Amino acid sequence: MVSVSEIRKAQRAEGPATILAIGTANPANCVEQSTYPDFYFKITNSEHKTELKEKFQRMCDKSMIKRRYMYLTEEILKENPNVCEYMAPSLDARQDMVVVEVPRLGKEAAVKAIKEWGQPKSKITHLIVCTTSGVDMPGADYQLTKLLGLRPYVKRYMMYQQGAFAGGTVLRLAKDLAENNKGARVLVVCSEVTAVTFRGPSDTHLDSLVGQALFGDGAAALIVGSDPVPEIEKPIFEMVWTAQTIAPDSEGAIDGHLREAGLTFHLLKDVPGIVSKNITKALVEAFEPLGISDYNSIFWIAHPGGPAILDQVEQKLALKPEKMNATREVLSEYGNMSSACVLFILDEMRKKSTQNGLKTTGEGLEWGVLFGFGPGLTIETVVLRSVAI
Amino acid sequence: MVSVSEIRKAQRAEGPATILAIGTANPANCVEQSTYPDFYFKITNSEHKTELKEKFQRMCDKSMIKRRYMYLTEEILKENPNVCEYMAPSLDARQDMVVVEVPRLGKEAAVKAIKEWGQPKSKITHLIVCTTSGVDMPGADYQLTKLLGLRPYVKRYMMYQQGAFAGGTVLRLAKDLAENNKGARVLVVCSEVTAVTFRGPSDTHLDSLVGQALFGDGAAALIVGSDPVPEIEKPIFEMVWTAQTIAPDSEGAIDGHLREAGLTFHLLKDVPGIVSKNITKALVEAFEPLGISDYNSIFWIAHPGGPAILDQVEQKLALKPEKMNATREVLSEYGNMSSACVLFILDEMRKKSTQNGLKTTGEGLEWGVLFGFGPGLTIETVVLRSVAI
């Protein structure tokens, strides 16, 4: 009797998944980078490690980060000496921080996105939450449903322990949820808190130390939907095509293990080298089908894992220095916020484009690319189209 | 110049997401339930806790589980006393087990699904991995990509710390990935290992104790795609509609926290009561639009969190005793395997339907329902259509 073909035709959306609102938030504690080496070596009781402190000073001076926002404060760190050690049992304390802070910070960003969107939160049909900081059951998706008062029947996607490429992963996921479901409006929240990875310095673990110069906190929220209601909703960017891949010869480039001493990273190859070496193949896969091969002709969003990734990509491709302006401005004012970074960069780009009277939200250009980089080594690619004005 | 409308039309699939292959696997160690109370109280050094052992005997006798498969053995447990205690620092040891066992067991199930499917593994475009046992970076999705030799550009969805409703969550996700992307073939793997939750008994934590009578290990893998190639591929079930909701008055019904002592569950209400009280609303949302209100007329798959959930649902709705046969057979022969359970039940159902000469893979019936239950309290609903023969 019942036709599945008819149900399927009626159930799906028609146009491209579109970003309709972006909102961000960060912990209130602003930590200057200029003074961080002194602060970090003093709070971890490592002032005697003179040569290591000099190496960390050089890491901070080359970071290209001016400041970062951290949930962790001097007072919290003084109450948690095992978090200040390089390797001490401390997961319970870290989890107690981040199981609450991830959804709290995500809530602030989401409220800002929902206000911009301007439509009832009862129209949110799907919720994607993403974090690399802590895990719990029910997860941060259930907590944000409760905190925001979303409908209990919101369809949830809890992306845990994902890593820094997952701002691209949540976009890749939201595209399919919005496009295959008529009326669907997806709230996307990436919320990342360094309390799980902060730890003291050790001279035989310099890969862990460079994370202490770069990682910062923040959350970003999006509303994503297909078939925007003209003039009620306001498109910012459209998603057109996505990919994910594992770079060859990158085994163990970025490992991260969640243990009794928290989350510890381990770096085993040359991340800037691997990303630079494999970015062109990612661009030809995305843009050869669209007939574009001039990579200065598109707008750019790249996860700023560190400044060397950006510099080597710019050099490899001969990007004009300005292509990475929005990326570098986020790195400078917030540091590497893992999965959220790329979403802050989208917000900076559209805000500066609009503020400065450019013709599109993608710096006056039509087509754009967003890249996430992280453990695997994984590269996430999202092809975007800007919107006029 | 470029038309996004044309790209979107060309990029999407046309028909309903279809399950094209199912494969399962379990650890080799088969643990009888009849003797488990003696084994478990002896291995955890709790033989002196006489009244608690009697309560556990009653839990096991009412479980309706005949046997379970466990990665954990007597030899492993004897090497890990802190895993045998109710609450001892042990996450590092547990993580070391499950970061390897989750992908190993998932690989076995996936190979079986890929063999059934019969098509090149190079046609797998998307991979969803789901587990509640351990987390790592790169995740179990990267490990399975490597173990199976999938293409490096497979698009991955790593669902961590999800909980027992997530066999429904992976179906909900795979439906959108398959339906919105022409040609997409999704490998879905749920792989669940009790090494993260096993722990000794405590008479002030009886909610943790009932998990020790019920939780078992296993993995299940699916191939999901839209637009199956007639007679090359072989549809088993079609997905038509999905939902997820949070039952009212269920705050803290099933909490699970991942700590330095591993994953510990905490039960605070009446799960069978909450599920039974809210299942009818879930069924009317799913089936009122299809015009069906006789819930014996559809085929059933329900997460067997415990036998009381099943009994109270059967009683509430006046299901014939046979509706839950496939569900109860899985509970009996494997116990509660968290997210994988529901996928084992789909395999049992289609195998028994085919074996016994019924007309469809859904026990001779056309429409069916699959439910996942877990932390939140969350209910996942997936509406399925069977396939002839």
Ligand SMILES: CC(C)(COP(=O)(O)OP(=O)(O)OC[C@H]1O[C@@H](n2cnc3c(N)ncnc32)[C@H](O)[C@@H]1OP(=O)(O)O)[C@@H](O)C(=O)NCCC(=O)NCCSC(=O)CC(=O)O
């Ligand atoms: C660290 C940088 C900002 C510095 O770049 P520069 O080229 O400008 O600078 P430089 O060599 O003069 O100083 C950088 C400092 O890094 C340190 N350093 C140098 N060699 C290194 C090595 N192989 N192992 C670890 N750290 C190293 C030294 O202290 C050195 O200063 P000196 O030797 O002179 O004292 C850049 O390397 C960077 O962007 N790398 C980031 C690549 C990446 O892995 N980031 C991904 C996320 S981090 C990660 O850890 C993820 C995670 O854990 O999940």
Ligand SMILES: CC(C)(COP(=O)(O)OP(=O)(O)OC[C@H]1O[C@@H](n2cnc3c(N)ncnc32)[C@H](O)[C@@H]1OP(=O)(O)O)[C@@H](O)C(=O)NCCC(=O)NCCSC(=O)CC(=O)O
């Ligand atoms: C445990 C059962 C198999 C037993 O059911 P019966 O009705 O047949 O039996 P019964 O009362 O005679 O014995 C069941 C035993 O459960 C124990 N028991 C009874 N009262 C309980 C309570 N409120 N707290 C905890 N456990 C309880 C007692 O030992 C009792 O035996 P006696 O008192 O006579 O010694 C059933 O309750 C069940 O299916 N519950 C499962 C509901 C659910 O929560 N499962 C979700 C996953 S578990 C979870 O823990 C998830 C997780 O942690 O993530």
